[PDB]
Ligand SMILES: O=C(O)C1=C(C(=O)Nc2cc(Br)ccc2-c2nc(C3CC3)no2)CCC1
C-alpha cells in the first residue's frame with residue numbers, strides 16, 4: 141500500500157470552471173478550445189511498483205502518461221505542445237509541472253471528500269475541474 145492509492149481508480153468529470161480561459165492562457169487555438177471544452181473525460185489512474193499511469197479518455201483525444209515521481213519526462217499534451225514534465229507528491233497532492241518555450245503551467249490533483257479535484261494554473265489564471273468515481 142501507498143498513500144498514492146487514494147488516487148487510483150476510474151474517475152469521471154463532473155464540473156469545470158474557467159477552463160476556456162486557462163486554455164487561452166496556455167495558447168490553445170479557438171477550434172481546439174471549443175472541442176476540448178466539450179470533452180467529458182474519464183481519468184484512469186493506476187500504480188504498478190514505482191510507475192504511475194494516468195490515462196484520459198474522451199471523444200476528442202485519448203492520452204496516457206507513465207512516470208516515476210520526481211523524474212522528468214517528455215510529454216505531448218492533448219493540445220500538441222511538446223513539454224518537459226515533472227510530477228511529484230507534495231503533502232498528499234500530485235503536482236505536475238510542464239515547461240515549454242520558456243513558459244510553465246502547473247496542474248495539481250488532490251482528493252477532497254469523494255472528489256478528485258484538478259487545479260490548473262497558467263500565470264494568473266486557475267481552472268478547477270472536479271472528478272468523481274465512475
Ligand atoms: O481535467 C484534466 O485532466 C486537465 C486537462 C484536460 O482534461 N484537457 C483536455 C482533455 C481533453 Br479530452 C481534450 C483536450 C484537453 C485539452 N487541454 C488543453 C490545454 C489546457 C491543457 N487543450 O486540450 C488539461 C489540464 C488538466
Ligand SMILES: [Br-]
Pocket residue numbers: 179181182196197198200201202203
Ligand atoms: Br481526454
